[model samples]
Target: DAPDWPAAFVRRYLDAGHWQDQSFAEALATSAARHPRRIALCDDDQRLSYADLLQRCRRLAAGLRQAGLAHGDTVVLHLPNGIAFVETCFALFQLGVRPVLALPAHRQHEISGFCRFAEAKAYIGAERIDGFDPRPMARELLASGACRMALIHGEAEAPLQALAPLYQADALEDCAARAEDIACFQLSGGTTGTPKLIPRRHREYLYNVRASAEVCGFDEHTVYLTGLPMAHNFTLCCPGVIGTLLASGRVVVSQRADPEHCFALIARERVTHTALVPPLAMLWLDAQESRRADLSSLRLLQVGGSRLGSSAAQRVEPVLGCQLQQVLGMAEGLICYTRLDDPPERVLHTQGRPLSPDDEVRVVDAEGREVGPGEVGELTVRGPYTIRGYYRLPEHNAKAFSADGFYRTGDRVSRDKDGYLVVEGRDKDQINRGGEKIAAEEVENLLIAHPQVHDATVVAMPDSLLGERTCAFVIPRQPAPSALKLKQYLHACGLAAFKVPDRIELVPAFPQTGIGKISKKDLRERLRRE
Candidate 1:
């Protein structure tokens, strides 16, 4: 069994009516029953009604069962943005199969790491997506005995048939899971070697989904677009796809969030709302002047993943002609969002507040003492949806949580008098490239594996678009390796392209802190000066 929340914490949330005994699949069932004929999901190809979606999900679940996959089995989803992503996710949920959502950018290293950690039984992916073929990765997983099955969506030679016609409606049955069962595994934006796995319980996770939709003012008329990767926490349930479905609203699936592509979809689908990272938000804003696509139908645009610059945040509504909401969330839980009715200043300047009234927040200094109002400090949170511990990470989990159960968020922030959060910075040893968190140590570990690298330090360099990009400072051995060669080496290591250094600097030695440790602060300053 996965690590569980404390009974006291669980009971408190249940007593407070913040959490209920219902799974996400049941929530979808409720929406289908309520709006049987309403369009539930669509892409460029086709649309599915609420009834169609429910039946398809059940059928797919039955197919999985027939393929020897059973309830409680873990599967890693490495598909890109598509209709299949939506269908397969719900199907897995319906059968009580825990999906370990892996982003499309993830390659062999990341996928295998997740499979090893979760002890996953299956790997689901598309044949080809965004020019990356996942079939090789799937083959490797199967060859290495990492997975029992490799399920693909598109037309490719498969040991098993594609997910398209793999359903058995007659064989469907009620899910064999409780409300408090482990619903799925969400990847952590961690500052550690391995991407930590987060166990999201059905009850608390669904509560957040509902709360997010309510806060964002989603309804039957809402035509939400999945602009971000469907696996991402912000895209999956920052009141995203599930919430849209639960509210009987329609969702438009997009392969990419590029202004050209997404703008066209927005116009065609009359997409009322969508979410983006800071980088994509900037791109959309910059493209608005020369673009002809009608953005009048777009109502709300949520920006999060990384820190949205105050300047870019302000430009969002003016350029895109939509209400801007800043999302501050983590897969580990504790999602904060700016309300629609929030003042312009708060919406543009602050990262809203917690979804649940029972969400306990603490801004603490280094000594674990609470800081006064407006004082910058580390943010710690515990709430209905926030995870008590990461799955199977006992030692790190101990360090992550306080004795009282507050998860140390590693974010440095201060609350305004009105409870609005103004992010100061993050204390985590990671780089926030766009919204993707790259662990510094993880990259450094891989770099040290190289023959030409004696020592290496990875630091976040300023990027006007991506918020932060990884710059590696390498202290090479005699006969230094070229940056190009190192880049190829990392690629050969099967690391995700995003984790590869955007810029590599050959250094004689790293700047040292007072304690003789490498001064990443100095490295950042060097980049800023340049």
Candidate 2:
């Protein structure tokens, strides 16, 4: 469970008018009432109006309630980008059931870990993704009593549960959720063996969504396209899905994010705005010369998840034919976006400013003192949207935040004279591979357990496209195994495809610090120098 904001902080937040007690359930109902006939969501196969989506979610919530699920119960909502993902989120929001949003890339390992940590009551998934059936894994979780029941989005057999009845079942018209209730769980991209849980309350999260939507200039005619995974915080509530619905705008969910497919979809849907990581942004820009798709409808392009180079930022407007907006954010909160109307220099150079002017920010050195003017230091923040503590991580919370209650965002950045931030890098041991976050410790923990591995150190290596690629330096016990063999081991261990190291280098030993600790800095620099 997440800790409540310091009582004083709560009073201040409410007094400051940052939190409006706007529950997601209320937002959805209001949007539906205002524009019942407006198409709220669409994909290649389905189109659901605001009224239809509300009814579908209410009925699904009712059926889930009858199936032994109740308020405050936790559910694992692991599905890909589509109408069903949006439906599951709103249904859980209305019923007051907390959803641990899992990415489609998450396999049995990550999913099961979240289930155990969250003490989930139910697990929801898709019928099959890419010819691989996830039902057996769901069954394994069910059999072990990790979760009470399991349901798949598409078709399912008798023993395996299905969502068919839920769609046609009775409606749960009235919401039982409260403003302060933790609406959902978002995974933190941190330096740990497993991702940490982030409890997002209804009021605060809605504030973030609505505020971001307003900043992005969302309106009824806004057609938002999510080329990234909808499960991600960047693609979900960062003026992504729910924000579009709240504005009575249309949302287009796509599972395939490749340029060939996405370009066609943008033209077909008349998509006005979309979000992409820096790597994909480069790819899309590169594709312009090779193949061109109708991108005239695209007005705004958001590049986020990592730093976008100034050169790449400049190319966005010229090549993609849209205004470039840089989004620097986290699941734990504190979203910073380059304003849509900012000067060209700020847009091309910096990662924008805070979503809220009230967001208290401090750039401090190692001793926690503020940096001198123009000096880059670690970023720490606390605000209406930023979380007070990571869910159930007390020991880590002490170090993750300051004593006065500011989340120590390990990001290294410099706030320019105009308050726009220029990200230098991160101090944490997590690899941001193309926008997918992989905690080095998680992969190292797995590598160290391999039979042939005596010790392991995983560090990032520079990559032009991915921004960073993971390389595992392993010392052998018996003998060095092939990189392919070790990679297969990680796969066999059920690590996500993205978590697997891109390269493996066998090392006889590690560089050590004078204090006898493993010198990861020297180790990383060794690669950089090489």
Candidate 3:
């Protein structure tokens, strides 16, 4: 069981009427009852109404139950963007099972780590998606005793749907989890040795989605497009799919966010809103110059996951023909969004403000003294929705938070007197390559695992397109290995393709800081100069 929030914190949120004692399953049931025939979901295969979605979820849950999975059991969801991903998620939620949401890019190394950390019972994924086959990784995880079962989605021996029929002869009761119980375990964007799991309760997470929807002007008329990874914090609940469903709006699912697919979907479905990282936003802006897709129906484009460059932020409105809302958020807690009513300058310059007024934010210097407005400092926050502790990590939790319970967010920012934040850079030792965070230590540790490697260090190199790319500096034990050989070795380690270094440099020694630590700042400068 997950730890409970403090009595004072829970009481305050409930007393303020911000938290409703209802689960996401109950919320979906309410929407289904109110709009049974309303179109709820659209994908490549078919369009499902509210009633259809709810019934499909129920049947999926019943089938899983029949397969011997029960409440409180943990499952890892590792599928790509599709209807099955969404349906399976809701089915798990309805059955009171906790899902460890894994990104599609994850391979054996990352997936095995997540499954072992969560002690997952089942692993669900596609046999093959795009050009990658996850079945090998799934089978490896199953073989290693990381998980008990593999539920596949594509052409495989035991496809997920084959395990259970679509329709159930007997009705299954809505055995949804309690409001305060953990709805799911969200993955941290890995800044540590390994990714941490976040425990989010039904009440807090639902409140986040609903409040985000209202802030972004979501209503029954809204038609949202899921372009990002559906399991990602940005696409899942930064008013993405769940908010659209809660508002009784329609959703369009896309397998890819490229212009060839997403643009056509927006034009055909009349998609009113969608979210993107800065890189995808830039791609869409560039594609608009040549492609003649009718995007006049797009009312909003939410750019987040990383800070948007001021130059690109300026072009969003003119290029996309929609209002640009900058979203700066994390899965652990605290989402900031530039409101629709804000001035153009604010939208272009700031990451907006906190979702709740009770979100206590402090900008402090290295010594923990509060900084004045316009002065850049590390951001620390404590809020109703912000997690007090990472799931099952006490030593990390001690260093990652303050005595007063404010989480050390690791983001460097400057706030105006009006409370709007302008992100300067990050304080964490992680590389943000086109919004995909790669933990430097995680990669460094794996590189050292190579028999030929004596020491290794990873640092971010500036990129015009991807914000930053990784470059690994290595010290060999005897003879230095070629970059290609080292790259192949990392692949053999089952590291995700994105986590592999784009460039490798052979260094005899590393620059050291004043404290005799590896000077990553100096390494970054060296890479910048290269």
Candidate 4:
């Protein structure tokens, strides 16, 4: 069914103002005022009130400043999922310090590139986690004389100077910040190479958060469960980190985000709102009966950071006893999401409409003209809250954005008449097998429909004759069958023979990026190495 195009066009005017004027710090203050007693964050070991969090953030901001953190100073966040990550982020923003967030799993090789790109002045990370020593990397960064501060969290005192002195009494007393100022130098997926940085500031960042709450119909009553990577925008901005402050929602952090721990948190905390990655959400649904907890309190489940097929969403729906919402976009800003009141078809077929009055999306053809309904085009967007350019990367900023200033999402989409957009697939991800252009998402969707396929990722493999061929990476529900058997199954389903994967690899778990997305580029690289 088509969307109502007229209403969508009419709504364009809502996004006229700039986000800089409406700051994130003010939103946090407002939330603390209204919901001082509400539990803003919960972990297995700690529970913090909104007021408490704000105070800590204030202190942390003071601490960072006392430790020599200054505005525009790049601080690398190489921590895992925990309270510290959130605390540090808010504190940095409050101090006008820009966090150059890096994922914890990144090895020394990856860290070096990011540190250099960001011109990092500091690195905050775990001293040690499960035998992975971050200090060596931190030392390497520090040795460069580039990283001046090393804040390590661990069971024992780190060899480097502790952060205690930074947060000493005087530092936080009169901290200062501006809304239009950069809050975080967010790492982009950087599909073509090393990730680019997106500058997210207080005003736009806060507005994006509040608009998300409004779009998802969340308010003071919402309770959010956080499990995504600490540096990931999906968890930080959505599911009410920003929303929590704006709407006074409760945020519960499940550090151990497995089904067992997640179920317990939901039941014990009576969480009413949360976001889940599709793969893990499906796991919860599969083991719902085995979980020792009550789940009737869950009201909404927004899944993304990866694809969520209709079949997976269906499995998780009745079991969670909540509406399954889909979220799309990243640090660039909130693009589309599933609303609470949307129909199942709209929910399943499209990622919800854009957040009202904050963002604008255009499905444009090669010539930069808006495409007609149902025709797939590159998704270009411009908005008050979205990133207009990258940090210090003029060459990239030029190529990534259009002449008129719309950001090229590098994604292909089809919008219905009513402005509901269905992401078809990544333009580069379209497989060219023997000159045939086959979209990987289409085949992945078809494979997911098969009961045995729990989840799947399809990537293009290097081919001598075809230039590239389709490779199916399957996470099987049961045992994986033969490639020929899968081929026969696709043929029976009436899929074009060439569209069928030439190589089917059954993986126990998909390799993911720092933000928990399936690392197709990494997969292709691994294959090339082999």
Candidate 5:
């Protein structure tokens, strides 16, 4: 039997209650009853109350069942950032069906693989968005017979068999299923473009979001917005739809999060809480004065997926006028968060602490012995919520976990005397430029300071003279900036010359993950191909 836990741990378990066969639909409905009139979903031009959203969910569930999708079957939901995602998710969860979320940008490359991997029965997406017809693409995927059903979201612009009817998910009737079954399949960005899928079960899935809401101090009274991919785990379950349902708070649902658009939405909705990468926080901090849209309503901003130095934090606090909270969740399980009472210095340095009562964090060397206090080590973690292994990934799992069952995070970190975690660097993402080992983040951080550069991703590009050279792919606000100028700034900051990027390529924007972290993998591949 497990040992007796702490008072806080016991209280958390009791507050959220138990999950026998829990699904999001059930948890969301329970929340809806308590806050029926509260706003549950929003975008630039649309809003739905809890009661209103739940009713649509019922219709969607019924419609999905009528289409021949049954319990334990998988379906793909490929909508951009919109209200369709929320409706479709609840519909599927109501029938114990699983949803595989696919981002529109990934539709071109990921559809076939995702369909085959999830063994999906259906494919659902919008007819058109941002001048593209995803429904047409969905038909191409259906052509393979990998997916039997195709529920188009918009005008039914795609070629479909006369047998299949393209109706809105919200028009379907409700059909609730066993709450404890699998809810959806979330894919991870593998080292290669071939992704790894994580199947989330209902009850455990509820546990993740509820625990996160508790950590963030969310409530029905707050207003939140999601700028990340609704499909990604950190956003989908952490700060996206799940968080909104967990707190019964209002949500603004949209995908294209321009800095100006975010400001406009926050002010119009009087948004109270939001999450973003540290880089985005910096951008908002710098641009707030220009937008000047009564941002006083904003109360909390959660930052994560990348490290932001203390200097950035100091600059952000006064500019954004919101309390900065840190969230540290990767594709894996350790969901670390900074609490309200934490000191500013601590908040700026540490990745906060784990959220769940069953969470166990450790710092150990290659021999599996605990490192000395304040020494850097791989941050190994284990908990009730953390999976011991990836789905069907035996070799990777063997390399990722330790003998005692803790997942080796591959992140280099040190724990302070007060149990705070400060990230040192990643062990695998290092760049070997010529014979020198360089941390990619070190160079990327310097690039962000350039007046014209909004954000940057540093990767090791193969070179002739050097075994490998560091190239910085930058999102620029201006025409172009030379590598020499960026190197000068690095030298002024006391970084060694070789650690600086050898080449700089300017573009309009950085390719990002669902959670808004820059996708260095995409940049590296693009450069290698060129």
Candidate 6:
């Protein structure tokens, strides 16, 4: 069993009416019963109604069950956003299989790690994603005995079995799982040396979706577009695809979030609301200034995944002609969203209020003492949806949570008297490159293994566009490699492209603190000045 929330907290949430005993099956069933004719999901290729999606999910589950996938079994699901992703996810949800949602960008290093850690039975991926085929990774997993079966969706060359036939499998009964049962696994956005997986239960996660959907004002008429990876927490469950489907609304899947495509999509599909990171929002705004698209149907633009500067935040509405709602949330779960009717300044500067009144929030100093209102400190949160501990991480849980059960978010923020939050920065040892979380030590650990490197340090460098970009400062041993070669080496090591450092500086030594520790803060300051 995955680590569970305390009974007292669970009781409190139940009594507070915040958590309705429901599962993903109930969500789709209820939606289909109520709006059988409503379009549930649409992609560039086809659209499916609520009933259609429901049946498709069940048929796929039957196929999985026939293939020996059973209730409570874990599977590594690596796919991009498309009809296949939606169908596969719901099928797993219906069959009570806990899917480890791996991003399409993840390669052998992360995928193999997940397979070994989760002790998964099967690996499910696509024929190709972003021009790279993951079938080879699936083959490697199968050969290494990491997974017993590997299924690749979409068309692939001979030898790899296509997952298309699964949709034709006979419908199966829903697996009997408690509301508190683990729904799925979400990867942490990088921080600790040992990467962590987040387990979100059915009831708590559904409440999270409903609360977000209510706040976002989603309805049947809402045509939401997704440009981010479907595996991402922000795109998947932050009132995203699941939430849209739950509200009997339609979801438009987009492989590209670029302005040229997204703007055209907004016009074509009449997309009411969509989510984006800060950098893409800025790009959309800039693109709108040059070439205006028919964005009249667009209503709300939810920006999160990283902090959006006030300057870019203010331009969202003016350029796109849509309301800007700042979302601040974590996969481990405290979702805060600015209300639609919030004051203009709050929408511009603050990251909104918690989705639930039961969300216990506090800003604490170094010793975990509560800071005064509006005082910047570490943000700690506890709630029905927020996890008490990461999946199977006992020792790490202590460092991540307080004695009182609050998750010690590495973010530094201040909440005003009105409960709106203003983010300060992160105390976490990671870099936020355009919403892509790259653990500094994760890269450094790999770099140290490189023969050309004696010592290495990875730190954030200021970027006008991405907010931050990684700059590697390496103290080479001999036959020092070029930056291009180092990047190629990292790619060969199977790291995601986003994690690669933007620039490399082969230096004699790093700037050190008075205590003789490497001063990353000094390095950042130096990069900003340079």
Please give the lDDT score at residue 67 for candidate 2: 82
* Per-residue lDDT of model 1, residues 1-530, tens digit only: 46666889878888988788788888888889999998999988899999988888888888888876788889998888877888788888888899998877677888999887888888888888657988877788888888878888877675634766676545475876678889899887653435778999899899999889989999999999988888888888988988899889999988787788888888899999998865467568657343688989999998876556555566677777899999889899998888999888788678888888988999999999999999878999998899888888889888999988899999988899988887755685458999997756557757766766766778898899999988999877668899998899889989999999999989877774211235667788889898
Q: What TM-score would every model get versus the actual structure?
A: 0.81, 0.82, 0.81, 0.90, 0.85, 0.81
Top candidate (TM-score)? 4
Which candidate gets the maximum lDDT versus the true structure? Answer: 2
The models' CA-based lDDT, in order, is: 0.82, 0.83, 0.81, 0.73, 0.72, 0.82
| lDDT (Cα, 0-100) at 196 in candidate 2 | 81
**Residue 268: error of model 2 in Å?**
0.5
Q: On residues 1-530, what C-alpha lDDT tens digit does candidate 5 reach at each position?
A: 11222456435544656334456777788888998887888876778888888887777676667778788788877777778788778878888888886765675567777787778888777766545776666777778776876777656644553212323445544445655455677676544555666656676567788778877778876787776667776667775567877688888876765668888788888888888787677678667355677778888888887777665666556877888887777655677888978998788767887777667899987777899999878889976456566656777777877766787877878788877787766665567877887866667666776666667777878888887888877776665666676667778888887887788777777777544667767777888898
- Which residue pairs clash within candidate 4? 3-417, 3-418, 4-418, 63-166, 63-167, 337-352
Residue 512, candidate 1: C-alpha displacement in angstroms: 27
The candidate, 3 or 5, that scores higher on TM-score is: 5
lDDT of 3 by residue, 248-348 (tens): 99999987888768888889999999998765675686573445889899999999876675566777788778999998898889899999999987898
| lDDT for 100 (candidate 6) | 94
**Cα RMSDs, all models:** 11.0, 11.0, 11.1, 4.9, 4.7, 11.0
**Poorest stretch of ten by lDDT in candidate 5:** 160-169
> What tens-digit string does per-residue lDDT give for candidate 2 at 401-462?
88888999888888999888888666865478999877665676577667676566678888
